[PDB]
Amino acid sequence: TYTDTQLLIDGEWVDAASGKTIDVVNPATGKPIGKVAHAGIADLDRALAAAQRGFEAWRKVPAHERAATMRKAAALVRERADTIAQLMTQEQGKPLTEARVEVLSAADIIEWFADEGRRVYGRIVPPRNLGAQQTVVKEPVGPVAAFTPWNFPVNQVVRKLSAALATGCSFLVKAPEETPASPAALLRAFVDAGVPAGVIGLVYGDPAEISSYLIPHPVIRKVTFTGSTPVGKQLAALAGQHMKRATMELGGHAPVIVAEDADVALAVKAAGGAKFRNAGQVCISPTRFLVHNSIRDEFTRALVKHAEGLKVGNGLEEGTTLGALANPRRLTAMASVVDNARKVGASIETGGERIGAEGNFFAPTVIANVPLEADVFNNEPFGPVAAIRGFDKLEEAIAEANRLPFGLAGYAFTRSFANVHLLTQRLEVGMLWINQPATPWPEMPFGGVKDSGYGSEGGPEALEPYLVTKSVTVMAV
Amino acid sequence: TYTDTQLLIDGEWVDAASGKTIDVVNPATGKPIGKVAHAGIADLDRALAAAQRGFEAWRKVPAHERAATMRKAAALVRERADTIAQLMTQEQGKPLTEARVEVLSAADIIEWFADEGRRVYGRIVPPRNLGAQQTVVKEPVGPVAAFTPWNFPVNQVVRKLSAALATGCSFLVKAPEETPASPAALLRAFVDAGVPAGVIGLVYGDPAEISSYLIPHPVIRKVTFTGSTPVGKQLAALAGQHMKRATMELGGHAPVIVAEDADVALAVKAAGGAKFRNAGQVCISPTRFLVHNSIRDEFTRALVKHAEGLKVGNGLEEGTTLGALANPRRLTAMASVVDNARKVGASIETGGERIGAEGNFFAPTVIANVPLEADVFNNEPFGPVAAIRGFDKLEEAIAEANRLPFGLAGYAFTRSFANVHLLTQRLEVGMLWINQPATPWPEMPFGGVKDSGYGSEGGPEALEPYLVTKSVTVMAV
Amino acid sequence: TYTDTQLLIDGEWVDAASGKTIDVVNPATGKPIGKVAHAGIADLDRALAAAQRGFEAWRKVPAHERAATMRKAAALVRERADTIAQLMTQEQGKPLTEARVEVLSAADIIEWFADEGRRVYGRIVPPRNLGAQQTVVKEPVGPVAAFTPWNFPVNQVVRKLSAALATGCSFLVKAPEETPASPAALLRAFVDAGVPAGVIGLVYGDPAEISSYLIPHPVIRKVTFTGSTPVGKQLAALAGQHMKRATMELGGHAPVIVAEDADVALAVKAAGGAKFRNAGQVCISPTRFLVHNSIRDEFTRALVKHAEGLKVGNGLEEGTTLGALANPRRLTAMASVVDNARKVGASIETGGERIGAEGNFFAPTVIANVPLEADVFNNEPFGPVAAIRGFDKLEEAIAEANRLPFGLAGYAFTRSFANVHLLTQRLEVGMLWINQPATPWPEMPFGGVKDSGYGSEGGPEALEPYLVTKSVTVMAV
Amino acid sequence: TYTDTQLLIDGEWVDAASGKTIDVVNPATGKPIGKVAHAGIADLDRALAAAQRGFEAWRKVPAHERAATMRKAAALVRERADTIAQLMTQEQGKPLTEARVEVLSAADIIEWFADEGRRVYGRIVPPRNLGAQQTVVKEPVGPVAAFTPWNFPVNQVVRKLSAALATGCSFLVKAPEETPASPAALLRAFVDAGVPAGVIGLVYGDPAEISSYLIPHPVIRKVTFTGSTPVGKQLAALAGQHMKRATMELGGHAPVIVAEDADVALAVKAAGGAKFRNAGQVCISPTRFLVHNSIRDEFTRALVKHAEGLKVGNGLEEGTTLGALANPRRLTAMASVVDNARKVGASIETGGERIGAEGNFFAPTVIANVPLEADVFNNEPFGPVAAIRGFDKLEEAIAEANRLPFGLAGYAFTRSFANVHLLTQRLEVGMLWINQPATPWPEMPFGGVKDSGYGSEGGPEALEPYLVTKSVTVMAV
């Protein structure tokens, strides 16, 4: 059953001071299922004061003790995976099998970052004067304000939170209001694991009012944001105005390059399965399919058959492989994308229409003969729609893949080492997957370039935005 | 003799399209000595087009060949050290001996970064699937727009330029208009060393108009700024609005902690000499002298005697150890700082008045019994003035040193390991020097925290802002 | 109750083919308590064949799966800590509290190395030709033959085994015959955790015959030995004769430097407690106490009082802080060391005689006025005896601490940063502890120099002896 | 003109105390050209005493000053490249063009290691107790004894010497007696560059007597050897007997795998040119050509034509691409290898006989249809002879390439990423080159596995054998 969500301030789950709440609806039915507290300025003041105290206590806990507490939270998350997955499905719409995968991988993310926190190594530099010692020490930056979207309510919070806790920083996150229950369950596991009060905080309310107050507040030292590019540009400008360290993970437009020597069956299974994961509402979802003209037609038929094999329905019902879209605004965007494709002369091979009249169900869509001016090839669709366009020379495919200002993810399918070497050097993406779907592991860096933002949420590089570099030189006399 | 300065666009030294120029005056006499080209929008268009082509060519040159070209430029800089130093002294005001030290250390900076460019190492991660290869590759971010102040016309340009060239990026810098000749001489050495046309560019003009056009331009991928905090906040907000990667080095307010067990003679020689380097117009200049009450009076007398031993005059004349201030606005700031100190009850131990009536000469000033509300203890003076305040407990000195939002540099003097360990952990600075003056080496990270900005200009960390991290996973089938 | 010990070959606990056994006696009573299998050449043949197959399977298991199996073994070790500790006490003699600490710290060692195995990172080098890729890959060396002493039966096996398993190597260890039960219990936990058959092997018998056969065998690729220097020289020569990679951890002679400004009470508590840990039968046991003459007499009285406060008895009995020596040969060595000290003119401040007539109980001994020619100051005593000698200048203490060819551990006590910096630079030891007793953590390198051997058993450096470095350059054409 | 060679002891070029000398002959004519001093035990005593003093002085010189001295030596080597090359050709036999390449690449090796010495970084570990500091410091091991062969008289000395000098160690090398002049010229450049007396030493004489005395001497702390496997086993056993850290670079047996999809013309040009470099007297010379049966016959014809295009003659004469073998023992080995191949049924496609009657000239030899039992396929030929054998499946080629106990180098030629990935994982070699000849750069690790020794002479790993790892933990109280 779906439960109501409160705010987490200073270790206590509390209501807002004014008592205001926001209704939460099920995307598959459109009916209310619960509500979440709507925090005001007064609640943010208490959260910011608790965040300052939490940073003081957490930075004094040794790294091996912070790792032990973090790994106990990961065990609690893994124990409660079924319950958290059910909350995620009801509020977000993804199938129960996909929700369970996200929760289990979140526990894997916590465990890796817990060990990474014990390996934040300083440096000893060979001194210019042997009578002095030159060292480079690493310290937590301080309290962190975070903002996360609804696409992966638990996974997109767990990466920011794990990196902040592993370095010794405090963490105050505004989770998405449309999917509040599963992020609250993730933070409840950390509270039960023994994270001290004030080290972690959770708020909900008006996104614009909360971000406008936390970012300029002197307590906050670091801002991290994941979401849309237009919103990220607003918050990055505000962070720059007050000289706050910031990292941005924004929307992407992932190209897929299917070379002449590609395995067509492997490309359809990998890129097709990655296309419809989370109903295409993923920042790294394969969007622009650039298929070589020699095997383009065979690729299109197989992709259409794969899309027609998906079962669309309620995510709680067994056998569902494609759930409802998270919000009605995605339904409007899907209709606009398909309508524009028809106008510009593209062909709708399958899907392209709303299923039913209740919920946010949209059929998986494959579009062929897409011109370069179509909206689907310039703006991120963020839905279950694939666009296919042919090419002759691999240099033409690379040039098209680099045309847009989005630099987040890319995909390729080829057999020769020369093609792999060329695509590694030339594609302007933060992540490249060849001959397989995306497998984002905690040990691999996760981030984009250009308008997709900057900063990494995986690997050892994920801790650098939360750390300050200090040069120390002591003359021994 | 002082020469006029042109713009460097696409490998050619050219005038502005409109022919406009800006007069350059000698700070020690107030008389014109030359002029510098005033670039408009049209010249910026040619520079941006050349920067895009320069990035294409420079990124294809192997790292060992880029290092060889960089080291040849360092040899030319070292050969021309005397000529460059004379230009710096006439336009900026620092003594000829200090100018020569800056130029020679610039060549040392180039050589270190040339070797560091050959050690930009990728990573191979143990794969989750043995049939696939997981790698992390490093690539240049792209064209870089830079903005530098007049305090160190050559050194503050050479750090940004060396890091950009070592990673393979192109570099377009707006050097300060009041000190144009010595930055132009530094870039001339790189042109003579064989840097391809368009890889490096140099412009002058209206700082607001140039920054407002280069930062949002799609060609620019990375912005780096050094200067005042209020200006840095404007450019960081603009960079965030267009999602451009940015690094900021802003003003600081350096505290000095003289502990009970400190060597008083060593503290006066080290902190006093570092105070009046470049007439205190350094972002890491020791400003807030927190001296233990047991040896405060002895410290004050020795510091006053050290200040009175300085010879004030033209930087070209031999025997001068303190030159003229760089611009008349520093003269007004010095008078305002001393006047406010008198009002709040502080005592002027020495100096505190303008010397003569021609130029920008100000006497070295020592102020004692400074209250916490005085302007010198809250705002960065950026001049040859030291403020002394006593303390009893070391925890009180640490709390005062962390009170201001400036986090750039700190200084300490102590003998016990416990004091060194405590100050290393507690002081919120990017750089700490104990028992010695500041010795910024190219291998040591250089940067601040909080309102002093973010990012490092030394060590291996200096290359990270100019590099993009790409995760590559290739399934072998 | 004490159990008999079998061999672990190919995943099965089996007896020797000939059925021969070796009696195990309790060091505190001298009575038999059990027996251990005595393997011959035929059993070594089966173990070597199984080791080759175990390396093939284990090297194909992904690092994250090997880490999961290793952490499950650590949980089993922690669950069975009480049972393993009782076996260790009965066969080795250390108190039950010390035995429990060793077992619990062994589980901590396994967990750190499990995570370290996932961070064995390759390198990507900037190529001289952009058309080619230069990489440095890391691979397991292969099957490993190990030899461990009786001082820490579980801890000294767990460090070699954890490093071998984390890199993907197979591991065949000859555990000490006098303490066979607790090493067998540690390896039983790895078998129960799911380590495949042949990856781990355990043998007992004649140490000379086993080492003479495993080291030259073509299956073995790496040899690791911990024990006495004379035996290590024999096995290192044999390894060199057959070009087998080898690491050696041999005996040490740890100096303690108590400076003029040292905290005398802290030095007595830290160095005195570390002296009598495991009854001084530790390779890093503080042996040569060089105490400044100004506080030498006060230090000697406090150390004598600390030694007299130890309770000597059976390790199973509660309240015992000093157990029996592990074997009768240590009793003879203790008598010889004390007798030689009396002859050379040294004074026995406390202890120096055998306690009782049954077992291997020796009183804690403090010797003062020790000359430089005494046996205790030249040969490693490996017992509960401390030797004290005075000094005037710190340079004299450093010279004495570097006189012996032993380079394993050192201790110091001082307050000034200059003394800490000087001792860090000058002391020829692999490990230095100042103002505290030894705290060997898995993340810290553990090894010696000169006659103490080479190679590290902690930190990331502990994996290098088990890894091979391969340069790969592929031209893309 | 060829000059006589003296010993370098304590900064002075001196004769042996007994005055004994060893004649040096030209391999291309068999006539004497000079002589070299023959050092005895007494001269080794002076060299060892000077080495101890040289280590004391050199370890106190800062890394940036040691790098400056090293780079000045590299400039002198590059200036004197022509003179050094002429000495190398007359005494060793390789063509003048090859000798010049070796000398110029030696200067490149020095420059890389000079910069690498400034980046010997320590580590700061996150402490378990926040009141203490845990650091890992790196220090020079001490005096180093080196032994080098005649194949690359300058290059094989320069790698050991550059690594020793960059870490601060002293260096005493026994250069080969048959090629003494060019190693002496390389060390003369370091003396002229300002390396202090005793830091570098050079001796000649009886190799067995010198190695038997330097290795056990207490002054020597590290031994490094390059040469044949049987001799390396003798010196590694002696080093183990006295517990001296040792690294071994021994002979190899390089396989070449020409896959089905290989570029046959590229494989012949790359592997054929690498085969006859230095007349095949290289430890990484391609020896066992495993060519796929589909293109085996075409490969054999092209390789034969390439061998017949070589011009054999005196290395000083212009147009010579294959010089004389270095010593008459190589002539006997070449005849024995060809004779055994005829007996076992192999076919001599070209060459296989001595050219002329004066000198050590042997014709380039290509052997086809080589059985697995032939001497050329089991023992390292170390000459200008290639052996070709066909295969059907790539797994069969990999199994053959891993059959011998030699693990130094490997070569491959393929186009698919799957083949590259498979060969990288499976080939038991220290170095792998695909689609190109060997390009050993100073930044790439250089070393073997199994009977080829251990340790690396390139990359950052080349400094580890000359460094000691010290754990330091200081409790701040």
PDB file of C-alpha atoms in Angstrom, chain B residues 40-140:
ATOM      1  CA  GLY B  40      35.882  45.287 -31.213  1.00  0.00           C
ATOM      2  CA  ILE B  41      33.267  42.652 -31.957  1.00  0.00           C
ATOM      3  CA  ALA B  42      34.588  42.118 -35.494  1.00  0.00           C
ATOM      4  CA  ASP B  43      38.075  41.253 -34.232  1.00  0.00           C
ATOM      5  CA  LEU B  44      36.568  38.839 -31.700  1.00  0.00           C
ATOM      6  CA  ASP B  45      34.780  37.054 -34.553  1.00  0.00           C
ATOM      7  CA  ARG B  46      38.092  36.433 -36.329  1.00  0.00           C
ATOM      8  CA  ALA B  47      39.715  35.324 -33.064  1.00  0.00           C
ATOM      9  CA  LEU B  48      36.894  32.868 -32.328  1.00  0.00           C
ATOM     10  CA  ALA B  49      37.025  31.412 -35.846  1.00  0.00           C
ATOM     11  CA  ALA B  50      40.800  31.010 -35.557  1.00  0.00           C
ATOM     12  CA  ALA B  51      40.409  29.430 -32.109  1.00  0.00           C
ATOM     13  CA  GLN B  52      38.164  26.699 -33.534  1.00  0.00           C
ATOM     14  CA  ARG B  53      40.730  25.856 -36.218  1.00  0.00           C
ATOM     15  CA  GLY B  54      43.578  26.015 -33.704  1.00  0.00           C
ATOM     16  CA  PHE B  55      41.858  23.471 -31.464  1.00  0.00           C
ATOM     17  CA  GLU B  56      41.460  21.080 -34.410  1.00  0.00           C
ATOM     18  CA  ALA B  57      45.168  21.188 -35.273  1.00  0.00           C
ATOM     19  CA  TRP B  58      46.561  21.264 -31.729  1.00  0.00           C
ATOM     20  CA  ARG B  59      44.491  18.308 -30.499  1.00  0.00           C
ATOM     21  CA  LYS B  60      46.011  16.158 -33.270  1.00  0.00           C
ATOM     22  CA  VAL B  61      49.623  16.930 -32.286  1.00  0.00           C
ATOM     23  CA  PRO B  62      51.072  14.171 -30.058  1.00  0.00           C
ATOM     24  CA  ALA B  63      51.743  15.043 -26.429  1.00  0.00           C
ATOM     25  CA  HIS B  64      55.508  14.573 -26.745  1.00  0.00           C
ATOM     26  CA  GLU B  65      55.584  16.968 -29.710  1.00  0.00           C
ATOM     27  CA  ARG B  66      53.462  19.530 -27.851  1.00  0.00           C
ATOM     28  CA  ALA B  67      55.864  19.252 -24.908  1.00  0.00           C
ATOM     29  CA  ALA B  68      58.855  19.867 -27.188  1.00  0.00           C
ATOM     30  CA  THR B  69      57.237  23.007 -28.613  1.00  0.00           C
ATOM     31  CA  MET B  70      56.306  24.200 -25.113  1.00  0.00           C
ATOM     32  CA  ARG B  71      59.845  23.739 -23.777  1.00  0.00           C
ATOM     33  CA  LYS B  72      61.252  25.714 -26.712  1.00  0.00           C
ATOM     34  CA  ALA B  73      58.916  28.572 -25.770  1.00  0.00           C
ATOM     35  CA  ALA B  74      60.187  28.369 -22.182  1.00  0.00           C
ATOM     36  CA  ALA B  75      63.771  28.723 -23.425  1.00  0.00           C
ATOM     37  CA  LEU B  76      62.814  31.818 -25.433  1.00  0.00           C
ATOM     38  CA  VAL B  77      61.082  33.322 -22.386  1.00  0.00           C
ATOM     39  CA  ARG B  78      64.190  32.699 -20.276  1.00  0.00           C
ATOM     40  CA  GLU B  79      66.423  34.211 -22.972  1.00  0.00           C
ATOM     41  CA  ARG B  80      64.264  37.363 -23.119  1.00  0.00           C
ATOM     42  CA  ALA B  81      63.772  37.686 -19.349  1.00  0.00           C
ATOM     43  CA  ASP B  82      65.538  41.053 -19.061  1.00  0.00           C
ATOM     44  CA  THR B  83      63.541  42.677 -21.872  1.00  0.00           C
ATOM     45  CA  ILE B  84      60.198  41.364 -20.594  1.00  0.00           C
ATOM     46  CA  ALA B  85      61.021  42.477 -17.042  1.00  0.00           C
ATOM     47  CA  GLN B  86      61.695  46.058 -18.159  1.00  0.00           C
ATOM     48  CA  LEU B  87      58.320  46.218 -19.914  1.00  0.00           C
ATOM     49  CA  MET B  88      56.583  44.844 -16.812  1.00  0.00           C
ATOM     50  CA  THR B  89      58.221  47.373 -14.478  1.00  0.00           C
ATOM     51  CA  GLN B  90      57.334  50.409 -16.605  1.00  0.00           C
ATOM     52  CA  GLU B  91      53.654  49.487 -16.992  1.00  0.00           C
ATOM     53  CA  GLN B  92      52.902  47.793 -13.643  1.00  0.00           C
ATOM     54  CA  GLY B  93      55.270  49.423 -11.137  1.00  0.00           C
ATOM     55  CA  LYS B  94      56.950  46.501  -9.371  1.00  0.00           C
ATOM     56  CA  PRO B  95      60.747  46.657  -8.941  1.00  0.00           C
ATOM     57  CA  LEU B  96      62.945  45.282 -11.704  1.00  0.00           C
ATOM     58  CA  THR B  97      64.276  42.525  -9.431  1.00  0.00           C
ATOM     59  CA  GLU B  98      60.748  41.298  -8.676  1.00  0.00           C
ATOM     60  CA  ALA B  99      59.793  41.487 -12.359  1.00  0.00           C
ATOM     61  CA  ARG B 100      62.785  39.336 -13.330  1.00  0.00           C
ATOM     62  CA  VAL B 101      61.835  36.720 -10.724  1.00  0.00           C
ATOM     63  CA  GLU B 102      58.314  36.523 -12.164  1.00  0.00           C
ATOM     64  CA  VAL B 103      59.544  36.045 -15.740  1.00  0.00           C
ATOM     65  CA  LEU B 104      62.094  33.373 -14.806  1.00  0.00           C
ATOM     66  CA  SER B 105      59.498  31.492 -12.750  1.00  0.00           C
ATOM     67  CA  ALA B 106      57.103  31.644 -15.713  1.00  0.00           C
ATOM     68  CA  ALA B 107      59.588  29.638 -17.791  1.00  0.00           C
ATOM     69  CA  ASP B 108      59.792  27.121 -14.942  1.00  0.00           C
ATOM     70  CA  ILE B 109      55.987  26.869 -14.988  1.00  0.00           C
ATOM     71  CA  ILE B 110      55.938  26.135 -18.733  1.00  0.00           C
ATOM     72  CA  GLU B 111      58.504  23.341 -18.429  1.00  0.00           C
ATOM     73  CA  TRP B 112      56.586  21.546 -15.673  1.00  0.00           C
ATOM     74  CA  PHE B 113      53.280  21.673 -17.561  1.00  0.00           C
ATOM     75  CA  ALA B 114      54.942  20.482 -20.777  1.00  0.00           C
ATOM     76  CA  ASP B 115      55.986  17.282 -19.001  1.00  0.00           C
ATOM     77  CA  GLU B 116      52.616  17.035 -17.230  1.00  0.00           C
ATOM     78  CA  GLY B 117      50.856  16.969 -20.601  1.00  0.00           C
ATOM     79  CA  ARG B 118      52.595  13.695 -21.458  1.00  0.00           C
ATOM     80  CA  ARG B 119      51.228  12.110 -18.254  1.00  0.00           C
ATOM     81  CA  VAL B 120      47.503  12.675 -18.801  1.00  0.00           C
ATOM     82  CA  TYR B 121      46.714   9.030 -18.096  1.00  0.00           C
ATOM     83  CA  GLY B 122      43.540   7.127 -18.820  1.00  0.00           C
ATOM     84  CA  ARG B 123      42.332   4.209 -16.738  1.00  0.00           C
ATOM     85  CA  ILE B 124      41.415   0.571 -17.346  1.00  0.00           C
ATOM     86  CA  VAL B 125      38.744  -0.670 -14.937  1.00  0.00           C
ATOM     87  CA  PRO B 126      38.363  -4.366 -14.006  1.00  0.00           C
ATOM     88  CA  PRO B 127      35.264  -5.293 -16.005  1.00  0.00           C
ATOM     89  CA  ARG B 128      32.085  -6.811 -14.645  1.00  0.00           C
ATOM     90  CA  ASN B 129      31.971  -8.939 -17.815  1.00  0.00           C
ATOM     91  CA  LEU B 130      35.307 -10.376 -18.927  1.00  0.00           C
ATOM     92  CA  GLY B 131      34.187 -10.288 -22.565  1.00  0.00           C
ATOM     93  CA  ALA B 132      34.087  -6.479 -22.529  1.00  0.00           C
ATOM     94  CA  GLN B 133      36.688  -3.768 -21.949  1.00  0.00           C
ATOM     95  CA  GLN B 134      35.997  -0.777 -19.690  1.00  0.00           C
ATOM     96  CA  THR B 135      38.241   2.261 -20.149  1.00  0.00           C
ATOM     97  CA  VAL B 136      38.281   5.884 -19.014  1.00  0.00           C
ATOM     98  CA  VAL B 137      39.841   8.225 -21.579  1.00  0.00           C
ATOM     99  CA  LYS B 138      40.862  11.869 -21.209  1.00  0.00           C
ATOM    100  CA  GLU B 139      40.424  14.458 -23.960  1.00  0.00           C
ATOM    101  CA  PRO B 140      40.822  18.238 -24.260  1.00  0.00           C
TER     102      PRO B 140
END
